[PDB]
Amino acid sequence: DTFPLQTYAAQTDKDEAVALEIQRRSYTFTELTVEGTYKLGVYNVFLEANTGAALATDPWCLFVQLALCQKNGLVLPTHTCNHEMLVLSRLSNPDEALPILVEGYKKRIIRSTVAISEIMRSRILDDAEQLMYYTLLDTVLYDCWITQIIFCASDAQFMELYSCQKLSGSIVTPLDVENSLLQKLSAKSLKISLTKRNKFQFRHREIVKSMQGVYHNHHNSVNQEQVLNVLFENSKQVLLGLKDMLKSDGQPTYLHLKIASYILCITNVKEPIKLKTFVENECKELVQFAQDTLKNFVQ
Protein backbone atom coordinates (compact mmCIF):
# COMPACT_ATOMS: atom_id res chain seq x y z
CA ASP A 1 0.00 0.00 0.00
CA THR A 2 2.80 2.38 -0.95
CA PHE A 3 1.74 2.07 -4.60
CA PRO A 4 -0.06 5.37 -5.30
CA LEU A 5 3.20 7.26 -5.65
CA GLN A 6 1.40 10.58 -6.06
CA THR A 7 -2.06 11.51 -4.86
CA TYR A 8 -3.64 14.86 -5.70
CA ALA A 9 -6.40 17.00 -4.26
CA ALA A 10 -9.79 15.51 -4.89
CA GLN A 11 -11.08 17.28 -7.99
CA THR A 12 -12.89 20.62 -7.74
CA ASP A 13 -14.50 21.09 -11.18
CA LYS A 14 -18.28 21.15 -10.89
CA ASP A 15 -20.99 21.25 -13.53
CA GLU A 16 -22.37 24.76 -13.18
CA ALA A 17 -25.51 23.87 -15.15
CA VAL A 18 -26.41 21.28 -12.50
CA ALA A 19 -25.92 23.80 -9.69
CA LEU A 20 -28.32 26.17 -11.47
CA GLU A 21 -31.00 23.48 -11.69
CA ILE A 22 -30.62 22.61 -8.00
CA GLN A 23 -30.89 26.29 -7.09
CA ARG A 24 -33.96 26.55 -9.32
CA ARG A 25 -35.64 23.74 -7.37
CA SER A 26 -34.47 24.75 -3.89
CA TYR A 27 -36.57 26.73 -1.44
CA THR A 28 -35.09 27.99 1.81
CA PHE A 29 -36.68 27.81 5.24
CA THR A 30 -35.52 30.84 7.20
CA GLU A 31 -35.34 31.68 10.93
CA LEU A 32 -26.82 24.52 11.41
CA THR A 33 -23.20 24.14 10.33
CA VAL A 34 -23.35 22.04 7.13
CA GLU A 35 -24.34 18.71 8.62
CA GLY A 36 -27.38 19.56 10.73
CA THR A 37 -29.50 20.69 7.80
CA TYR A 38 -32.10 18.58 6.02
CA LYS A 39 -33.71 18.88 2.59
CA LEU A 40 -37.38 18.00 2.15
CA GLY A 41 -38.03 16.40 -1.23
CA VAL A 42 -41.47 17.34 -2.54
CA TYR A 43 -43.40 16.70 -5.75
CA ASN A 44 -43.83 20.36 -6.74
CA VAL A 45 -44.38 23.77 -5.16
CA PHE A 46 -47.26 26.22 -5.58
CA LEU A 47 -47.42 29.91 -4.73
CA GLU A 48 -50.16 30.77 -2.28
CA ALA A 49 -52.16 33.78 -3.47
CA ASN A 50 -52.90 35.16 0.00
CA THR A 51 -49.58 35.11 1.86
CA GLY A 52 -47.05 34.39 -0.87
CA ALA A 53 -45.41 31.34 0.68
CA ALA A 54 -44.01 28.36 -1.21
CA LEU A 55 -46.17 25.38 -0.28
CA ALA A 56 -45.96 21.82 -1.54
CA THR A 57 -48.70 20.76 -3.95
CA ASP A 58 -49.44 17.45 -2.19
CA PRO A 59 -51.25 17.03 1.16
CA TRP A 60 -48.60 14.66 2.51
CA CYS A 61 -45.64 16.82 1.49
CA LEU A 62 -47.35 19.96 2.78
CA PHE A 63 -48.13 18.29 6.11
CA VAL A 64 -44.49 17.28 6.59
CA GLN A 65 -43.44 20.80 5.57
CA LEU A 66 -45.72 22.37 8.17
CA ALA A 67 -44.53 19.85 10.76
CA LEU A 68 -40.90 20.72 10.02
CA CYS A 69 -41.64 24.43 10.44
CA GLN A 70 -43.38 23.72 13.74
CA LYS A 71 -40.72 21.39 15.18
CA ASN A 72 -37.72 23.57 14.31
CA GLY A 73 -39.35 27.00 14.43
CA LEU A 74 -38.87 27.75 10.75
CA VAL A 75 -40.61 30.12 8.35
CA LEU A 76 -42.15 28.89 5.09
CA PRO A 77 -40.10 29.74 1.98
CA THR A 78 -41.00 32.44 -0.51
CA HIS A 79 -42.02 31.47 -4.04
CA THR A 80 -25.60 30.90 4.89
CA CYS A 81 -26.69 27.24 5.06
CA ASN A 82 -30.37 27.15 6.03
CA HIS A 83 -32.23 23.86 5.75
CA GLU A 84 -33.99 23.61 2.34
CA MET A 85 -36.98 22.34 0.38
CA LEU A 86 -36.19 20.44 -2.83
CA VAL A 87 -38.55 19.91 -5.72
CA LEU A 88 -37.72 16.36 -6.76
CA SER A 89 -38.95 13.59 -8.98
CA ARG A 90 -40.70 10.53 -7.55
CA LEU A 91 -37.82 8.47 -9.04
CA SER A 92 -35.32 9.76 -6.50
CA ASN A 93 -36.34 6.82 -4.28
CA PRO A 94 -36.76 3.09 -4.72
CA ASP A 95 -40.19 3.57 -3.09
CA GLU A 96 -41.26 6.18 -5.71
CA ALA A 97 -43.09 8.30 -3.14
CA LEU A 98 -42.08 11.77 -2.35
CA PRO A 99 -42.24 13.31 0.91
CA ILE A 100 -38.64 12.33 1.66
CA LEU A 101 -36.11 13.87 4.02
CA VAL A 102 -32.43 14.23 3.14
CA GLU A 103 -30.49 14.94 6.35
CA GLY A 104 -26.76 15.59 6.42
CA TYR A 105 -23.92 15.95 3.93
CA LYS A 106 -21.14 13.40 4.53
CA LYS A 107 -23.20 11.23 6.89
CA ARG A 108 -26.27 11.76 4.75
CA ILE A 109 -29.41 9.86 5.83
CA ILE A 110 -32.45 9.44 3.58
CA ARG A 111 -35.78 8.93 5.32
CA SER A 112 -38.34 7.56 2.89
CA THR A 113 -42.08 8.26 2.89
CA VAL A 114 -42.87 5.19 5.00
CA ALA A 115 -40.23 6.32 7.50
CA ILE A 116 -41.68 9.84 7.86
CA SER A 117 -45.20 8.41 8.21
CA GLU A 118 -43.96 6.28 11.12
CA ILE A 119 -42.23 9.34 12.61
CA MET A 120 -45.29 11.57 12.21
CA ARG A 121 -47.81 9.16 13.73
CA SER A 122 -45.45 8.38 16.62
CA ARG A 123 -45.85 11.95 17.91
CA ILE A 124 -49.63 11.44 18.25
CA LEU A 125 -49.60 7.77 19.24
CA ASP A 126 -50.05 8.53 22.95
CA ASP A 127 -53.50 10.04 22.35
CA ALA A 128 -55.84 7.34 21.07
CA GLU A 129 -58.75 9.47 19.82
CA GLN A 130 -56.45 11.68 17.72
CA LEU A 131 -54.99 8.52 16.20
CA MET A 132 -58.47 7.52 15.00
CA TYR A 133 -58.99 10.86 13.25
CA TYR A 134 -55.47 10.82 11.80
CA THR A 135 -56.15 7.34 10.42
CA LEU A 136 -59.48 8.56 9.01
CA LEU A 137 -57.88 11.44 7.09
CA ASP A 138 -55.02 9.25 5.88
CA THR A 139 -57.38 6.61 4.59
CA VAL A 140 -60.80 8.06 3.74
CA LEU A 141 -59.93 11.68 2.91
CA TYR A 142 -56.67 10.51 1.32
CA ASP A 143 -58.37 8.04 -1.03
CA CYS A 144 -60.90 10.60 -2.18
CA TRP A 145 -58.18 13.16 -3.02
CA ILE A 146 -56.14 10.59 -4.95
CA THR A 147 -59.15 9.39 -6.95
CA GLN A 148 -60.24 12.96 -7.72
CA ILE A 149 -56.76 13.81 -8.98
CA ILE A 150 -55.98 10.56 -10.84
CA PHE A 151 -59.42 10.07 -12.41
CA CYS A 152 -61.52 13.25 -12.23
CA ALA A 153 -58.99 15.97 -13.05
CA SER A 154 -57.30 16.36 -16.42
CA ASP A 155 -53.73 15.28 -17.09
CA ALA A 156 -52.56 18.91 -17.08
CA GLN A 157 -53.99 19.49 -13.60
CA PHE A 158 -52.32 16.30 -12.35
CA MET A 159 -48.88 17.11 -13.80
CA GLU A 160 -49.15 20.65 -12.43
CA LEU A 161 -49.26 19.20 -8.90
CA TYR A 162 -47.38 15.90 -9.12
CA SER A 163 -44.53 16.56 -11.54
CA CYS A 164 -41.28 18.52 -11.50
CA GLN A 165 -41.38 18.81 -15.31
CA LYS A 166 -41.47 22.41 -16.46
CA LEU A 167 -44.63 24.39 -17.17
CA SER A 168 -44.70 27.52 -19.31
CA GLY A 169 -47.76 29.37 -20.59
CA SER A 170 -48.26 28.20 -24.17
CA ILE A 171 -46.44 26.59 -27.08
CA VAL A 172 -44.17 29.16 -28.74
CA THR A 173 -40.87 27.20 -28.92
CA PRO A 174 -39.95 23.75 -30.29
CA LEU A 175 -38.69 23.10 -26.74
CA ASP A 176 -42.27 23.69 -25.58
CA VAL A 177 -43.52 21.11 -28.09
CA GLU A 178 -41.61 18.19 -26.59
CA ASN A 179 -42.24 19.41 -23.06
CA SER A 180 -45.91 19.09 -23.97
CA LEU A 181 -45.20 15.54 -25.17
CA LEU A 182 -43.55 14.47 -21.91
CA GLN A 183 -46.69 15.50 -20.05
CA LYS A 184 -48.74 13.17 -22.26
CA LEU A 185 -46.28 10.28 -22.48
CA SER A 186 -45.37 10.16 -18.80
CA ALA A 187 -48.62 11.20 -17.09
CA LYS A 188 -49.86 7.64 -16.62
CA SER A 189 -46.61 6.33 -15.11
CA LEU A 190 -46.63 9.19 -12.60
CA LYS A 191 -50.22 8.27 -11.70
CA ILE A 192 -49.27 4.63 -11.16
CA SER A 193 -46.44 5.59 -8.79
CA LEU A 194 -48.81 7.73 -6.72
CA THR A 195 -51.14 4.79 -6.14
CA LYS A 196 -48.38 2.89 -4.31
CA ARG A 197 -47.82 5.39 -1.50
CA ASN A 198 -50.28 4.92 1.40
CA LYS A 199 -51.05 1.32 0.38
CA PHE A 200 -53.74 2.78 -1.90
CA GLN A 201 -53.03 -0.09 -4.32
CA PHE A 202 -54.02 -2.60 -1.63
CA ARG A 203 -57.23 -0.86 -0.54
CA HIS A 204 -58.26 -0.21 -4.15
CA ARG A 205 -56.76 -3.09 -6.15
CA GLU A 206 -59.38 -3.18 -8.90
CA ILE A 207 -59.40 0.53 -9.77
CA VAL A 208 -55.59 0.48 -9.72
CA LYS A 209 -55.57 -2.59 -12.00
CA SER A 210 -57.90 -0.81 -14.43
CA MET A 211 -55.36 2.03 -14.63
CA GLN A 212 -52.60 -0.31 -15.80
CA GLY A 213 -54.41 -1.20 -19.00
CA VAL A 214 -55.33 0.24 -22.38
CA TYR A 215 -58.72 1.22 -23.93
CA HIS A 216 -60.62 1.52 -20.57
CA ASN A 217 -63.69 -0.69 -21.22
CA HIS A 218 -67.22 0.14 -20.11
CA HIS A 219 -67.34 -2.43 -17.31
CA ASN A 220 -64.19 -0.99 -15.75
CA SER A 221 -65.59 2.52 -16.21
CA VAL A 222 -68.88 1.85 -14.44
CA ASN A 223 -67.23 -0.02 -11.56
CA GLN A 224 -64.81 2.88 -11.14
CA GLU A 225 -67.73 5.32 -10.99
CA GLN A 226 -69.31 3.30 -8.18
CA VAL A 227 -66.16 3.23 -6.04
CA LEU A 228 -65.40 6.92 -6.59
CA ASN A 229 -68.96 7.88 -5.67
CA VAL A 230 -68.77 5.96 -2.38
CA LEU A 231 -65.36 7.51 -1.65
CA PHE A 232 -66.78 10.99 -2.23
CA GLU A 233 -69.98 10.38 -0.24
CA ASN A 234 -67.87 9.19 2.69
CA SER A 235 -65.60 12.23 2.43
CA LYS A 236 -68.36 14.82 2.64
CA GLN A 237 -69.24 13.13 5.92
CA VAL A 238 -65.62 13.38 7.10
CA LEU A 239 -65.35 17.04 6.09
CA LEU A 240 -68.63 18.01 7.76
CA GLY A 241 -67.68 16.34 11.03
CA LEU A 242 -64.27 18.03 10.95
CA LYS A 243 -65.99 21.42 11.22
CA ASP A 244 -66.66 20.76 14.93
CA MET A 245 -63.00 19.96 15.58
CA LEU A 246 -61.24 23.25 14.89
CA LYS A 247 -60.93 24.94 18.30
CA SER A 248 -57.34 25.68 19.27
CA ASP A 249 -55.61 25.99 22.63
CA GLY A 250 -52.18 27.23 21.57
CA GLN A 251 -49.96 25.55 18.99
CA PRO A 252 -51.62 23.58 16.18
CA THR A 253 -51.91 19.84 16.72
CA TYR A 254 -50.58 17.39 14.12
CA LEU A 255 -54.22 16.65 13.32
CA HIS A 256 -54.82 20.36 12.69
CA LEU A 257 -51.74 20.48 10.47
CA LYS A 258 -53.15 17.54 8.51
CA ILE A 259 -56.63 19.04 8.15
CA ALA A 260 -55.07 22.32 6.98
CA SER A 261 -52.76 20.58 4.51
CA TYR A 262 -55.71 18.87 2.79
CA ILE A 263 -57.79 22.05 2.49
CA LEU A 264 -54.82 24.04 1.18
CA CYS A 265 -54.21 21.49 -1.57
CA ILE A 266 -57.87 21.01 -2.51
CA THR A 267 -58.38 24.77 -2.91
CA ASN A 268 -55.25 24.94 -5.10
CA VAL A 269 -56.80 22.74 -7.80
CA LYS A 270 -58.00 24.89 -10.69
CA GLU A 271 -60.60 22.39 -11.93
CA PRO A 272 -64.00 21.54 -10.40
CA ILE A 273 -63.08 18.08 -9.12
CA LYS A 274 -66.16 18.07 -6.74
CA LEU A 275 -63.82 18.10 -3.78
CA LYS A 276 -62.99 21.74 -4.52
CA THR A 277 -66.64 22.61 -5.17
CA PHE A 278 -67.75 21.03 -1.89
CA VAL A 279 -65.02 22.65 0.22
CA GLU A 280 -65.46 26.12 -1.30
CA ASN A 281 -69.25 26.07 -0.99
CA GLU A 282 -70.02 24.14 2.21
CA CYS A 283 -66.74 23.95 4.14
CA LYS A 284 -66.13 27.69 4.40
CA GLU A 285 -65.21 27.17 8.05
CA LEU A 286 -62.48 24.74 7.01
CA VAL A 287 -61.04 27.18 4.44
CA GLN A 288 -60.72 29.93 7.05
CA PHE A 289 -59.21 27.41 9.47
CA ALA A 290 -56.49 26.45 6.98
CA GLN A 291 -55.64 30.13 6.49
CA ASP A 292 -55.39 30.61 10.25
CA THR A 293 -53.24 27.49 10.64
CA LEU A 294 -50.83 28.60 7.93
CA LYS A 295 -50.25 32.18 9.04
CA ASN A 296 -48.37 31.14 12.19
CA PHE A 297 -45.65 29.73 9.92
CA VAL A 298 -45.08 32.87 7.83
CA GLN A 299 -43.43 36.21 8.58
Binding site: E129, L131, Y133, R205, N220, Q237
Partner: protein, 307 residues
Protein backbone atom coordinates in the same frame (compact mmCIF):
# COMPACT_ATOMS: atom_id res chain seq x y z
CA UNK B 1 -84.01 1.08 1.23
CA UNK B 2 -84.54 -1.67 -1.37
CA UNK B 3 -81.58 -3.78 -2.42
CA UNK B 4 -79.87 -7.15 -2.17
CA UNK B 5 -76.88 -7.78 0.10
CA UNK B 6 -74.38 -10.35 -1.19
CA UNK B 7 -72.26 -12.20 1.38
CA UNK B 8 -69.79 -15.07 1.75
CA UNK B 9 -71.43 -17.72 3.93
CA UNK B 10 -73.44 -20.86 3.31
CA UNK B 11 -76.89 -22.14 4.25
CA UNK B 12 -77.65 -19.95 7.24
CA UNK B 13 -74.76 -17.81 8.25
CA UNK B 14 -71.65 -15.96 7.16
CA UNK B 15 -68.29 -17.60 6.57
CA UNK B 16 -65.32 -17.10 8.86
CA UNK B 17 -63.06 -15.89 6.02
CA UNK B 18 -65.11 -12.68 5.84
CA UNK B 19 -65.34 -10.76 9.12
CA UNK B 20 -67.20 -8.04 7.21
CA UNK B 21 -69.94 -10.50 6.24
CA UNK B 22 -70.27 -11.76 9.83
CA UNK B 23 -70.60 -8.21 11.14
CA UNK B 24 -73.26 -7.43 8.53
CA UNK B 25 -75.38 -10.45 9.49
CA UNK B 26 -75.13 -9.32 13.12
CA UNK B 27 -75.98 -5.78 11.97
CA UNK B 28 -79.20 -6.80 10.21
CA UNK B 29 -80.18 -9.19 13.03
CA UNK B 30 -79.82 -6.38 15.60
CA UNK B 31 -81.87 -3.69 13.83
CA UNK B 32 -84.84 -4.07 16.18
CA UNK B 33 -85.89 -0.47 16.83
CA UNK B 34 -88.26 1.26 14.41
CA UNK B 35 -85.63 3.69 13.14
CA UNK B 36 -83.16 0.81 12.96
CA UNK B 37 -85.66 -1.25 10.96
CA UNK B 38 -86.26 1.76 8.69
CA UNK B 39 -82.77 1.49 7.17
CA UNK B 40 -82.75 -2.32 6.91
CA UNK B 41 -86.26 -3.28 5.76
CA UNK B 42 -86.22 -5.12 2.46
CA UNK B 43 -82.51 -5.82 2.00
CA UNK B 44 -82.69 -9.45 0.78
CA UNK B 45 -79.57 -11.22 2.09
CA UNK B 46 -78.12 -13.57 -0.55
CA UNK B 47 -75.13 -15.84 0.10
CA UNK B 48 -73.99 -15.81 -3.52
CA UNK B 49 -70.24 -16.39 -2.88
CA UNK B 50 -69.02 -14.62 -6.02
CA UNK B 51 -67.06 -11.37 -6.01
CA UNK B 52 -67.89 -10.74 -9.68
CA UNK B 53 -71.02 -8.91 -8.49
CA UNK B 54 -68.83 -6.42 -6.60
CA UNK B 55 -67.46 -3.08 -7.74
CA UNK B 56 -64.08 -3.96 -6.19
CA UNK B 57 -64.08 -7.73 -5.63
CA UNK B 58 -65.04 -7.66 -1.94
CA UNK B 59 -68.19 -9.40 -0.85
CA UNK B 60 -70.32 -7.51 1.43
CA UNK B 61 -71.87 -5.93 -1.69
CA UNK B 62 -75.03 -3.84 -1.50
CA UNK B 63 -76.48 -4.00 -5.02
CA UNK B 64 -79.39 -1.62 -4.70
CA UNK B 65 -82.07 -1.63 -7.43
CA UNK B 66 -80.33 0.85 -9.78
CA UNK B 67 -76.86 -0.58 -10.25
CA UNK B 68 -75.71 1.36 -7.20
CA UNK B 69 -73.12 -0.85 -5.52
CA UNK B 70 -71.79 -0.07 -2.05
CA UNK B 71 -69.11 -2.56 -1.05
CA UNK B 72 -67.54 -3.48 2.27
CA UNK B 73 -69.01 -3.37 5.77
CA UNK B 74 -67.98 0.19 6.70
CA UNK B 75 -69.23 1.61 3.38
CA UNK B 76 -72.60 -0.14 3.67
CA UNK B 77 -73.12 0.98 7.28
CA UNK B 78 -72.24 4.57 6.37
CA UNK B 79 -74.62 4.31 3.40
CA UNK B 80 -77.46 2.77 5.42
CA UNK B 81 -77.11 5.37 8.18
CA UNK B 82 -77.33 8.13 5.57
CA UNK B 83 -80.71 6.84 4.35
CA UNK B 84 -82.44 6.98 7.75
CA UNK B 85 -85.99 8.30 7.28
CA UNK B 86 -85.92 10.45 10.48
CA UNK B 87 -88.28 11.42 13.31
CA UNK B 88 -81.69 2.29 24.03
CA UNK B 89 -81.49 -1.20 22.45
CA UNK B 90 -79.59 -3.93 20.55
CA UNK B 91 -78.28 -1.29 18.09
CA UNK B 92 -77.73 2.42 18.60
CA UNK B 93 -77.97 5.23 16.06
CA UNK B 94 -75.19 7.69 16.82
CA UNK B 95 -76.04 11.36 17.20
CA UNK B 96 -74.59 14.10 15.00
CA UNK B 97 -71.94 15.03 17.58
CA UNK B 98 -70.49 11.49 17.48
CA UNK B 99 -70.69 10.62 13.77
CA UNK B 100 -67.01 11.40 13.18
CA UNK B 101 -65.66 9.33 16.07
CA UNK B 102 -67.88 6.36 15.25
CA UNK B 103 -66.74 6.50 11.63
CA UNK B 104 -63.17 6.82 12.93
CA UNK B 105 -63.61 3.68 15.04
CA UNK B 106 -65.19 1.77 12.13
CA UNK B 107 -62.35 2.78 9.83
CA UNK B 108 -59.72 1.88 12.44
CA UNK B 109 -60.97 -1.70 12.80
CA UNK B 110 -61.23 -1.89 9.01
CA UNK B 111 -57.63 -0.85 8.24
CA UNK B 112 -55.72 -1.93 11.36
CA UNK B 113 -57.50 -4.76 13.18
CA UNK B 114 -58.99 -6.49 10.13
CA UNK B 115 -55.47 -6.54 8.70
CA UNK B 116 -54.54 -8.87 11.57
CA UNK B 117 -57.52 -11.20 11.12
CA UNK B 118 -56.55 -11.77 7.50
CA UNK B 119 -53.06 -12.53 8.80
CA UNK B 120 -54.40 -15.30 11.03
CA UNK B 121 -56.69 -16.57 8.30
CA UNK B 122 -54.17 -16.91 5.48
CA UNK B 123 -50.62 -16.34 6.73
CA UNK B 124 -50.87 -18.50 9.86
CA UNK B 125 -49.76 -21.82 8.38
CA UNK B 126 -51.65 -23.82 11.01
CA UNK B 127 -54.90 -21.99 10.28
CA UNK B 128 -54.50 -21.76 6.50
CA UNK B 129 -53.71 -25.43 5.85
CA UNK B 130 -56.12 -27.00 8.33
CA UNK B 131 -59.09 -24.69 7.92
CA UNK B 132 -58.94 -21.94 5.31
CA UNK B 133 -57.81 -23.47 1.99
CA UNK B 134 -60.32 -26.35 2.36
CA UNK B 135 -63.19 -23.95 3.09
CA UNK B 136 -63.67 -22.69 -0.48
CA UNK B 137 -64.57 -26.20 -1.64
CA UNK B 138 -67.98 -25.69 -0.05
CA UNK B 139 -68.36 -22.04 -1.09
CA UNK B 140 -67.35 -21.99 -4.76
CA UNK B 141 -67.84 -24.18 -7.84
CA UNK B 142 -65.97 -27.23 -9.21
CA UNK B 143 -63.03 -25.68 -11.16
CA UNK B 144 -62.70 -22.50 -9.07
CA UNK B 145 -61.55 -24.04 -5.79
CA UNK B 146 -57.80 -23.38 -5.75
CA UNK B 147 -57.27 -19.86 -7.11
CA UNK B 148 -59.35 -17.84 -4.62
CA UNK B 149 -57.50 -18.89 -1.40
CA UNK B 150 -54.18 -18.37 -3.19
CA UNK B 151 -55.20 -14.82 -4.16
CA UNK B 152 -56.41 -13.83 -0.69
CA UNK B 153 -53.24 -15.25 0.85
CA UNK B 154 -51.18 -13.18 -1.60
CA UNK B 155 -53.22 -10.08 -0.78
CA UNK B 156 -52.85 -10.64 2.96
CA UNK B 157 -49.09 -10.89 2.48
CA UNK B 158 -48.96 -7.50 0.73
CA UNK B 159 -51.11 -5.90 3.42
CA UNK B 160 -49.02 -7.29 6.29
CA UNK B 161 -45.44 -7.26 4.98
CA UNK B 162 -44.20 -4.04 6.61
CA UNK B 163 -45.29 -4.87 10.17
CA UNK B 164 -45.19 -8.69 10.38
CA UNK B 165 -43.30 -11.21 8.25
CA UNK B 166 -28.93 -22.92 -10.69
CA UNK B 167 -25.38 -23.55 -9.48
CA UNK B 168 -26.49 -23.69 -5.84
CA UNK B 169 -28.63 -26.66 -6.86
CA UNK B 170 -25.53 -28.06 -8.56
CA UNK B 171 -23.57 -27.19 -5.42
CA UNK B 172 -25.49 -29.34 -2.94
CA UNK B 173 -25.84 -32.07 -5.56
CA UNK B 174 -22.05 -32.09 -5.68
CA UNK B 175 -21.95 -31.57 -1.91
CA UNK B 176 -24.76 -33.45 -0.16
CA UNK B 177 -24.95 -36.37 -2.60
CA UNK B 178 -21.18 -36.41 -2.25
CA UNK B 179 -21.80 -36.24 1.49
CA UNK B 180 -24.85 -38.43 2.30
CA UNK B 181 -24.25 -37.02 5.81
CA UNK B 182 -25.69 -33.53 5.60
CA UNK B 183 -28.04 -34.86 2.94
CA UNK B 184 -30.59 -35.53 5.68
CA UNK B 185 -29.24 -32.60 7.70
CA UNK B 186 -29.84 -30.23 4.76
CA UNK B 187 -33.53 -30.12 5.65
CA UNK B 188 -32.46 -29.86 9.30
CA UNK B 189 -30.80 -26.60 8.25
CA UNK B 190 -33.91 -24.89 6.90
CA UNK B 191 -36.56 -26.11 9.35
CA UNK B 192 -34.32 -25.23 12.28
CA UNK B 193 -33.97 -21.91 10.47
CA UNK B 194 -37.75 -21.66 10.07
CA UNK B 195 -38.86 -22.42 13.62
CA UNK B 196 -37.16 -19.57 15.49
CA UNK B 197 -38.01 -17.33 12.53
CA UNK B 198 -41.67 -18.25 13.00
CA UNK B 199 -41.63 -17.46 16.73
CA UNK B 200 -39.97 -14.24 15.52
CA UNK B 201 -43.06 -13.57 13.38
CA UNK B 202 -45.55 -14.49 16.12
CA UNK B 203 -43.94 -11.99 18.49
CA UNK B 204 -44.31 -9.03 16.14
CA UNK B 205 -47.84 -10.08 15.24
CA UNK B 206 -48.85 -10.21 18.88
CA UNK B 207 -47.27 -6.84 19.59
CA UNK B 208 -49.26 -5.40 16.68
CA UNK B 209 -52.42 -7.12 17.88
CA UNK B 210 -51.82 -5.80 21.40
CA UNK B 211 -51.40 -2.17 20.30
CA UNK B 212 -54.35 -2.05 17.87
CA UNK B 213 -56.77 -3.54 20.40
CA UNK B 214 -55.45 -1.15 23.06
CA UNK B 215 -55.78 1.86 20.74
CA UNK B 216 -59.35 0.97 19.78
CA UNK B 217 -60.45 0.24 23.35
CA UNK B 218 -59.17 3.58 24.63
CA UNK B 219 -61.02 5.50 21.91
CA UNK B 220 -64.17 3.39 22.27
CA UNK B 221 -64.23 4.58 25.91
CA UNK B 222 -65.31 8.05 24.75
CA UNK B 223 -68.78 7.21 23.39
CA UNK B 224 -71.43 5.36 25.38
CA UNK B 225 -69.88 2.08 26.49
CA UNK B 226 -73.06 0.32 27.66
CA UNK B 227 -74.60 0.39 24.17
CA UNK B 228 -73.93 -1.46 20.91
CA UNK B 229 -72.55 0.45 17.92
CA UNK B 230 -71.54 -0.50 14.40
CA UNK B 231 -67.89 -0.26 15.46
CA UNK B 232 -68.40 -3.03 18.01
CA UNK B 233 -69.90 -5.48 15.52
CA UNK B 234 -66.85 -5.20 13.27
CA UNK B 235 -64.48 -5.45 16.22
CA UNK B 236 -66.25 -8.45 17.75
CA UNK B 237 -66.37 -10.21 14.37
CA UNK B 238 -62.57 -9.96 14.32
CA UNK B 239 -62.19 -11.60 17.74
CA UNK B 240 -64.81 -14.23 16.82
CA UNK B 241 -62.77 -15.32 13.82
CA UNK B 242 -59.36 -15.04 15.51
CA UNK B 243 -60.39 -16.87 18.69
CA UNK B 244 -62.36 -19.41 16.62
CA UNK B 245 -59.59 -20.58 14.29
CA UNK B 246 -57.50 -23.77 14.81
CA UNK B 247 -54.68 -21.64 16.25
CA UNK B 248 -57.19 -19.52 18.16
CA UNK B 249 -56.25 -20.50 21.71
CA UNK B 250 -52.80 -18.95 21.34
CA UNK B 251 -54.52 -15.57 21.00
CA UNK B 252 -56.96 -16.06 23.87
CA UNK B 253 -53.99 -17.02 26.05
CA UNK B 254 -52.10 -13.82 25.21
CA UNK B 255 -55.13 -11.50 25.24
CA UNK B 256 -55.87 -12.34 28.88
CA UNK B 257 -52.23 -11.67 29.79
CA UNK B 258 -52.71 -8.04 28.67
CA UNK B 259 -56.43 -7.25 29.04
CA UNK B 260 -57.53 -9.91 31.53
CA UNK B 261 -60.29 -12.48 31.60
CA UNK B 262 -62.99 -10.13 32.89
CA UNK B 263 -62.83 -8.37 29.50
CA UNK B 264 -62.19 -11.29 27.14
CA UNK B 265 -65.13 -13.15 28.69
CA UNK B 266 -67.27 -10.02 28.52
CA UNK B 267 -66.47 -9.81 24.80
CA UNK B 268 -67.01 -13.52 24.17
CA UNK B 269 -70.43 -13.56 25.84
CA UNK B 270 -71.48 -10.71 23.57
CA UNK B 271 -70.25 -12.70 20.56
CA UNK B 272 -72.11 -15.86 21.63
CA UNK B 273 -75.18 -13.70 22.23
CA UNK B 274 -74.93 -12.62 18.57
CA UNK B 275 -74.37 -16.04 16.96
CA UNK B 276 -77.31 -17.58 18.84
CA UNK B 277 -80.04 -15.22 17.64
CA UNK B 278 -82.95 -16.13 15.34
CA UNK B 279 -83.01 -15.25 11.63
CA UNK B 280 -86.47 -13.66 11.76
CA UNK B 281 -84.95 -10.25 10.95
CA UNK B 282 -83.00 -12.00 8.18
CA UNK B 283 -85.04 -11.87 4.98
CA UNK B 284 -83.08 -14.15 2.67
CA UNK B 285 -83.00 -15.33 -0.93
CA UNK B 286 -81.25 -17.82 -3.16
CA UNK B 287 -78.87 -16.64 -5.90
CA UNK B 288 -80.54 -16.47 -9.30
CA UNK B 289 -78.83 -17.57 -12.50
CA UNK B 290 -77.09 -14.20 -12.93
CA UNK B 291 -75.66 -14.07 -9.41
CA UNK B 292 -74.43 -17.61 -8.75
CA UNK B 293 -70.85 -17.83 -9.98
CA UNK B 294 -71.07 -21.05 -12.00
CA UNK B 295 -68.72 -22.24 -14.71
CA UNK B 296 -70.96 -20.60 -17.32
CA UNK B 297 -71.79 -17.51 -15.22
CA UNK B 298 -68.14 -16.68 -14.56
CA UNK B 299 -67.13 -16.93 -18.20
CA UNK B 300 -69.76 -14.37 -19.11
CA UNK B 301 -68.40 -12.19 -16.29
CA UNK B 302 -64.81 -12.84 -17.36
CA UNK B 303 -65.65 -11.83 -20.93
CA UNK B 304 -67.51 -8.77 -19.62
CA UNK B 305 -64.42 -7.42 -17.82
CA UNK B 306 -62.58 -7.25 -21.17
CA UNK B 307 -65.34 -5.68 -23.29
Amino acid sequence: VKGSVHLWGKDGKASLISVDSIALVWFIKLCTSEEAKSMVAGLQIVFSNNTDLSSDGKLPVLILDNGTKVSGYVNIVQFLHKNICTSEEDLAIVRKKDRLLEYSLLNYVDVEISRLTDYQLFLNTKNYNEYTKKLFSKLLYFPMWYNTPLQLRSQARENCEEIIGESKAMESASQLAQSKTFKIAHKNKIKGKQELQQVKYNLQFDNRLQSCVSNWLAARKKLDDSVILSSDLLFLANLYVQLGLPDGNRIRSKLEQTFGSELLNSMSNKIDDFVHRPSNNLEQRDPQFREQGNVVMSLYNLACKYI
